[PDB]
Amino acid sequence: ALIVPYNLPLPGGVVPRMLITILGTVKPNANRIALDFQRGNDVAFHFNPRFNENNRRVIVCNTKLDNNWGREERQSVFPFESGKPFKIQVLVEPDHFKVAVNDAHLLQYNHRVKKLNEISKLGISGDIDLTSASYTMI
Ligand SMILES: [Cl-]
């Protein structure tokens, strides 16, 4: 019911102990989902489930600096399913983003962008029905 792409402001950026929660449902025959934690035009953390990359499902993570993608971090474990509801939780830790999906740890992504307090927007996009997006301090 939120419109996608959705922008969630992160006031004053992110900080360790901040938990972001995204609830939605994957569309039928989805191709992609993306979370973009942005520092201005840079993407500090791109989290991109791909449903059909050469007939495999993979999650691709990266950082975009001055309009240039860096070295991808790719992961075989793929917990999403077309058609099904999901919960993504992104926990900011002192040295990485920690991602859990449906209450199961998925991956960690080391901070490349180190001005965490300038990562002030989260863009949520792709082939989902988005139910809610929020954050809290744990
Ligand atoms: Cl930085």
From Swiss-Prot:
Q: What does the record list as GO biological process? A: eosinophil chemotaxis; epithelial cell differentiation; innate immune response; macrophage chemotaxis; monocyte chemotaxis; mononuclear cell migration; mRNA processing; negative regulation of endocytosis
Name the UniProt key words of this record, in alphabetical order.
Answer: Acetylation, Cytoplasm, Differentiation, Disulfide bond, IgE-binding protein, Immunity, Innate immunity, Lectin, mRNA processing, mRNA splicing, Nucleus, Phosphoprotein, Repeat, Secreted, Spliceosome
Q: Name one GO cellular component term.
A: collagen-containing extracellular matrix
Motif Nuclear export signal, residue numbers:
114-129
| Tissue specificity of this protein | A major expression is found in the colonic epithelium. It is also abundant in the activated macrophages. Expressed in fetal membranes.
User: Listed GO molecular functions?
Assistant: carbohydrate binding; chemoattractant activity; disaccharide binding; IgE binding; laminin binding; molecular condensate scaffold activity; protein phosphatase binding; protein phosphatase inhibitor activity
Name the domain of life.
Answer: Eukaryota
**Keyword Cytoplasm on entry:** yes
Q: Which residues carry this modification: Phosphoserine?
A: 76
What residues does a beta-D-galactoside bind to?
69-75
- Location, primary (coarse class): cytoplasm
Q: Where, per UniProt, does this protein localize?
A: Cytoplasm; Nucleus; Secreted
Q: Where is the Galectin domain?
A: 6-136
Keyword GTP-binding included in the entry's annotation: no
Role noted for this protein = Galactose-specific lectin which binds IgE. May mediate with the alpha-3, beta-1 integrin the stimulation by CSPG4 of endothelial cells migration. Together with DMBT1, required for terminal differentiation of columnar epithelial cells during early embryogenesis. In the nucleus: acts as a pre-mRNA splicing factor. Involved in acute inflammatory responses including neutrophil activation and adhesion, chemoattraction of monocytes macrophages, opsonization of apoptotic neutrophils, and activation of mast cells.
- Give the quaternary structure: Probably forms homo- or heterodimers. Interacts with DMBT1. Interacts with CD6 and ALCAM. Forms a complex with the ITGA3, ITGB1 and CSPG4. Interacts with LGALS3BP, LYPD3, ZFTRAF1 and UACA. Interacts with TRIM16; this interaction mediates autophagy of damage endomembranes. Interacts with cargo receptor TMED10; the interaction mediates the translocation from the cytoplasm into the ERGIC (endoplasmic reticulum-Golgi intermediate compartment) and thereby secretion.
Q: What is this protein called in UniProt?
A: Galectin-3
Source species of the chain: Homo sapiens (Human)
